[PDB]
Amino acid sequence: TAILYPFTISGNDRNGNFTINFKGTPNSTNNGCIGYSYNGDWEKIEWEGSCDGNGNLVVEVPMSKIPAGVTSGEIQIWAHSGDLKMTDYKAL
Numbered sequence: 001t002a003i004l005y006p007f008t009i010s011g012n013d014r015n016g017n018f019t020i021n022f023k024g025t026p027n028s029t030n031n032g033c034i035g036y037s038y039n040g041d042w043e044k045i046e047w048e049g050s051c052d053g054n055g056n057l058v059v060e061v062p063m064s065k066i067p068a069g070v071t072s073g074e075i076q077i078w079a080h081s082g083d084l085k086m087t088d089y090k091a092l
């Protein structure tokens, strides 16, 4: 089953990286997306990654991938070999 976390951002500020911290099973395989509505339609930026030996995975997507005017959307986990939860996100 997919796991969805809503996010909210400034509509205008596009400095730096959309940075998501995940926590889960050491060395697990994982993938998903960041998704949002734009011009009426849902668009998706995919991520994939393994948790390190400490159980940490940091996904960084450039804020410039998300068009301006977008204020919200969802962090989605599509598959996870072990445990995985989003601890937080931040534009950085």
Ligand SMILES: OC[C@H]1O[C@@H](O[C@H]2[C@H](O)[C@H](O)[C@H](O[C@H]3[C@H](O)[C@H](O)[C@H](O)O[C@@H]3CO)O[C@@H]2CO)[C@@H](O)[C@@H](O)[C@@H]1O
Pocket: 002, 004, 033, 035, 042, 044, 074, 076, 078, 079
């Ligand atoms: O692309 C294959 C991938 O898709 C997963 O399903 C996703 C969709 O890709 C999409 O991101 C969808 O977005 C929803 C969103 O959750 C919200 O409800 C919004 O209003 O509407 C959009 C769709 O218009 O979310 C699902 C996940 O629930 C899933 O099938 C993966 O296993 C698969 O690899």
